Amino acid sequence: MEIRIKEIKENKLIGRKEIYFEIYHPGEPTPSRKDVKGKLVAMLDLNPETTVIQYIRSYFGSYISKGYAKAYDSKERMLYIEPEYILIRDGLIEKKEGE
Amino acid sequence: RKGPKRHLKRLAAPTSWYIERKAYKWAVRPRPGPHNMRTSIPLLYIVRDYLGYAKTAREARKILNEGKFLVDGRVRKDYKFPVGIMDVVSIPETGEHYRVLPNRIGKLILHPISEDEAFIKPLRIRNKRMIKGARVQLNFHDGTNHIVSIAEKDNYFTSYTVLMKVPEREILEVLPFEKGAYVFVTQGKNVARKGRIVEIKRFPMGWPDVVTIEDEEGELFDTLKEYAFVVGTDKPKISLP
Amino acid sequence: MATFKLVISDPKSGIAKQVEITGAETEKLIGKRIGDQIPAKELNINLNELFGKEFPEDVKLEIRGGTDKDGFPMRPDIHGPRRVRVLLSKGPGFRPKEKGERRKKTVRGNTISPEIVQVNVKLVY
Amino acid sequence: MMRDIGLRVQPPAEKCDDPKCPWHGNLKIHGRVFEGIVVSDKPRKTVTVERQYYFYLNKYERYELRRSKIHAHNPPCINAKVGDKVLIAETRPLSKTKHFVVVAVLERAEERR
RNA sequence: ACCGGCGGACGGCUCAGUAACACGUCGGUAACCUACCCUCGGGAGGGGGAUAACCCCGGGAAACUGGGGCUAAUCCCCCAUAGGCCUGGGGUACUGGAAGGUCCCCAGGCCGAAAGGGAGCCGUAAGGCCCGCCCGAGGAUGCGGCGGCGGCCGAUUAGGUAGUUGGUGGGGUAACGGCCCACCAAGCCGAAGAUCGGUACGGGCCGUGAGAGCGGGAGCCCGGAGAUGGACACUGAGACACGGGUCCA
């Protein structure tokens, strides 16, 4: 499996790079989030607990996955700002707030 | 309906915001303010959609509150606000400046112009009328107003260019429209064009009043006096489809 | 109908406590309007009236309010003893707190008869 | 009374009006204007104008006739002649069927050709 | 738990009635209002005052209700600073297509503005970021109102009408108006189909058909209408009020 960076945004106000991933799997099952943790910290080039994994869907039979990840400087900022699905998929926090 | 609609629907959201109209079922309805709801561009659309700086309305509301936009020289904080046409929207945090302009298509586009022009806002005033102390006051369709004169005939009837200094809310450098002046066309079906007025002559009585113009290409157009908006001798640049 | 319980209220310490009245010692109280003076000198089953005022001794009372069986109050100048229906608003009884600021509840009248269960009274002696 | 009404036209030479006219009070002339032939002129300070127009049938490529009546108020100063057009302006309601005053009166005539 | 402020009129649902200025499009209110909100200008000086909470206590199986001592606020008020509104007379300056709305002076009359903020940051308190209030003007948004044209069927429905058509004065409304009223007149309407009975939310569209045409109003969007049947007011810019009250069936 191979992770490549397609697209890079620089958001200054909050101090993060917003980043697009294409991840491959050829003859292999759908990418495994647990190895992708190990692989991520090097690709983004930021500490391991502030390099964040989000969004992947995986094509039907066409072996390419499209996806998004975050690289943050600020551990403080990230839990607060971000929409809850990310925080659980990375493993940070759950679901914020009920009724 | 017996009350202001507080909810706008997505299928009621136009094609002029260039928005997906089957996305949910509820569209962002600004609270009453400068401008019309369907002829505005929402603050939600500008942060969230346009630039990718939000992926939820909570991101975009938090981002606006901390600060990433000032509109007309002053602070905003919620995403509900109808941004007008011929306004000045600012990213202080990126240094971008935009004009809110029509296309030939008639969708709102933010058209980039330099940091310099952010200072300027051209006004062509909506009506001119007396207030107490025998002073006349200036008006707009975004409600942007100034007071204090000595009355009298003054610069024009109502077809003005003012240079407006936006943090100060001051008027400066007044200028008439002529029969050799510039207009950009910002309502009607002839929108996006910028040219030189041939003559401002019209149909002298009743409700219709024509004004006519030629351009650089030199096409002949006719539009209402109300839909003639005087840029000046050019201050902002043209809008592109 | 029902017997008179009297709640004797002391403006001196903001304590109200209650004595029981036979309800045939109250036929010298019959037909009065609010604000009238009640004599008590047979009425007083305690030596301070619980709290007072002190010996008592042999006090007067003034009529603060009354309450009915449903708990309905006296409102000053409702004519007669019967239950009468009025639009209440603010003030003694069913009190609105939601959109449109009327309410017709039925409330007890302001002539003392045995249909009053409890008479609020203030120690004015 | 005898004052400009806009539109590159004036009332007749002798014009004096009453309060329920556009030159008096906060009833005022604005906007549109209509022309029609006089049907009845029997009710006081009133004339009825009738407009013949045609409507189209798409099914049969042909026309039919229709005649809407408009009730108009006539100033007592001028009077109008039957079977010829009169020119009306649109002012705010006077009464129930009146919303319109007669501004200007035209009178024409004929025999055979 | 109590006053403040704001939503609760919206959002959601349904389409019975209604064949009409319901609805669509163009017009148009210079006859009319518009708070929250947004803009620009200016103002918030002083005095007065409460009731829950707390304390104490009665009843009703309940619903629900209480009487009193104390007491806070952007609490509730008055006065002034004015402004608003009416009315009579003079005259200019802004806006208009015109009518004529907006200016100012004067006389006499009334009503008689406002309120502030904790731990932080800015200013000296006020004030401001923030939240809200007052007055003047504008904007936006909602409500009402007028006109052009379009607006079903049965003629075994052909003549219809008494606020009914108009005039004049007036009341009442946010406001035009026979809306309501007094007086005065006898008009108004009709065969290019009035009136009456009957049926039906209307529109964008949709279904079908090569077209012409026919057929349709359903999800969905737009506008109006309703909320057991009927009647009724109050608070609010906005209700005669879809999970509010009064009352009748």
Instruction: Tell me if A23 sits within 8 A of A65, measured CB to CB.
Output: yes
When scoring A16, A76, A81 by the number of chain B Cβ atoms within 10 A, the one with the most, hence best to mutate, is: A81
What are the residues whose beta carbons fall under 8 Å from the beta carbon of A97, sequence distance 6 or more?
A: none
Tell me the C-alpha distance between A21 and A8, whole Å.
Answer: 10
The alpha carbons of chain A give a radius of gyration, in whole angstroms, of 14
Protein residue nearest nucleotide E150, by CA to C1': D55
With the C-alpha atoms ordered B67, B71, B75, B76, is the resulting torsion angle positive or negative?
negative
Beta-strand relationship, C37-39 and C60-67: antiparallel
Tell me the C-alpha distance between B202 and A52, whole Å.
Answer: 65
The amino acid sitting at B65 is N
What are the residues whose beta carbons fall under 8 Å from the beta carbon of A3, sequence distance 6 or more?
A: A21, A22, A23, A36, A39, A40, A43
The answer to whether residue B208 neighbours chain D at the CB level (below 8 Å) is no
By residue count, chain B amounts to 241
Sheet of C5-10: strand order equals C15-20, C5-10, C118-123, C60-67, C37-39
DSSP for C8-27 reads: EEETTTTEEEEEE--SSS-S
Beta-strand relationship, C5-10 and C118-123: parallel
CA distance A25 to chain B (A): 27
Covered bases, chain E (protein CB within 7 Å):
2-3, 7-12, 27-32, 35-41, 55-60, 62-70, 83-84, 93-104, 129-131, 136-143, 145-151, 164-169, 176-179, 185, 187-193, 212-214, 220-225, 233-235, 237-241, 244-247
Task: Using alpha carbons only, give the angle A55, A56, A57 rounded to the nearest 5 degrees.
Answer: 130
Tell me the C-alpha distance between B93 and B74, whole Å.
Answer: 15
Residue (of B115, B173, B164, B157) closest to B142 by Cα position? B164
Residue (of B178, B204, B186) closest to B87 by Cα position? B186
Beta strands, E only, chain C? 5-10, 15-20, 37-39, 60-67, 83-87, 104-108, 118-123
> Which chains lie within 8 Å of chain C at 3 or more CB pairs, if any?
none
Instruction: Tell me if B181 sits within 8 A of B160, measured CB to CB.
Output: no
Quick one: resolution in A? 9.0
Instruction: Tell me if B89 sits within 8 A of B100, measured CB to CB.
Output: yes
The answer to whether residue B53 neighbours chain A at the CB level (below 8 Å) is yes
Tell me the C-alpha distance between D69 and C91, whole Å.
Answer: 62
Tokens of B174: 């007044």
DSSP for B161-191 reads: EEEEETTTTEEEEEEE--SS-EEEE-SSSST
How does B20-38 read in b/e, with b if 16+ C-beta sit within 10 Å?
A: eeeeeeebbbbeeebbebe
Tell me the C-alpha distance between B88 and B140, whole Å.
Answer: 14
Instruction: Tell me if B196 sits within 8 A of B184, measured CB to CB.
Output: no
Taking CB atoms and an 8 Å cutoff, what residues of chain B touch A14?
63
Instruction: Tell me if B130 sits within 8 A of B154, measured CB to CB.
Output: no
CA–centroid distance for A45 within its chain: 13
DSSP for B70-131 reads: EETTB---SS---B-SS-EEE-TTT--EEEEEE-SS--EEEEEE-TTTTS--EE--S-EEEE
By residue count, chain A amounts to 99
Tell me the C-alpha distance between D88 and D37, whole Å.
Answer: 11
Residues A9, B52: C-beta atoms closer than 8 Å: yes
CA–centroid distance for C15 within its chain: 16
The alpha carbons of chain C give a radius of gyration, in whole angstroms, of 15
Residue (of D25, D38, D13) closest to D88 by Cα position? D38
Three-state SS at A53: strand
Three-state SS at A44: helix
